[PDB]
């Protein structure tokens, strides 16, 4: 149940990735912007429903206390290994057991907003242990641990 200042600050960094205008709320527009950048394309109705899963007070946006409630609960309720397994399935779009190096580079470039090309190159090179141009599940586990 314990939540350190550092853990809260890390969850705030996740919040601000979506709240790109820094107004303290995540809107359907901001959510859609991130999801589309990663190759998803939800309808406006789907985006509203997604906001509604997190929006505890029903005003149509996610504020940080709502975001933190949801993220701390997910961390508490999920074993660290399942958290990583789930994330791998998120980024393995085809479901073929691999994330291509190009796909991972795109995810990192969009989610690490200040990263340079050289930085993402090092990360990819380190991630793809066997050098086959894919990141498999065992390699993804090595990344996250």
């Amino acid at each position: 149940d314990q939540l350190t200042e550092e853990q809260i600050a890390e969850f705030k960094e996740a919040f601000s990735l979506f709240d790109k205008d820094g107004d303290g709320t995540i809107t359907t527009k901001e959510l859609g912007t991130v999801m589309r950048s990663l190759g998803q394309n939800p309808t406006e109705a789907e985006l509203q429903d997604m906001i509604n899963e997190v929006d505890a007070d029903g005003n149509g946006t996610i504020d940080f206390p709502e975001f933190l409630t949801m993220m701390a609960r997910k961390m508490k309720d999920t074993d660290s290994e399942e958290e990583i397994r789930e994330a791998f399935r998120v980024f393995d779009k085809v479901g073929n057991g691999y994330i291509s190096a190009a796909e991972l580079r795109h995810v990192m470039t969009n989610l690490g907003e200040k990263l340079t090309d050289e930085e993402v190159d090092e990360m990819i090179r380190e991630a793809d242990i066997d050098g086959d141009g894919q990141v498999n599940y065992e390699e993804f586990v090595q990344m996250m641990t």
Partner: peptide, 23 residues
């Protein structure tokens, strides 16, 4: 579960960035 997992996955990528910067 799907919505929560998508938010959590982006936090986990940011956690990787922190871990990588430490290594």
């Amino acid at each position: 579960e799907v919505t929560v997992g998508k938010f959590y996955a982006t936090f986990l990528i940011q956690e990787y960035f922190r871990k990588f910067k430490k290594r």
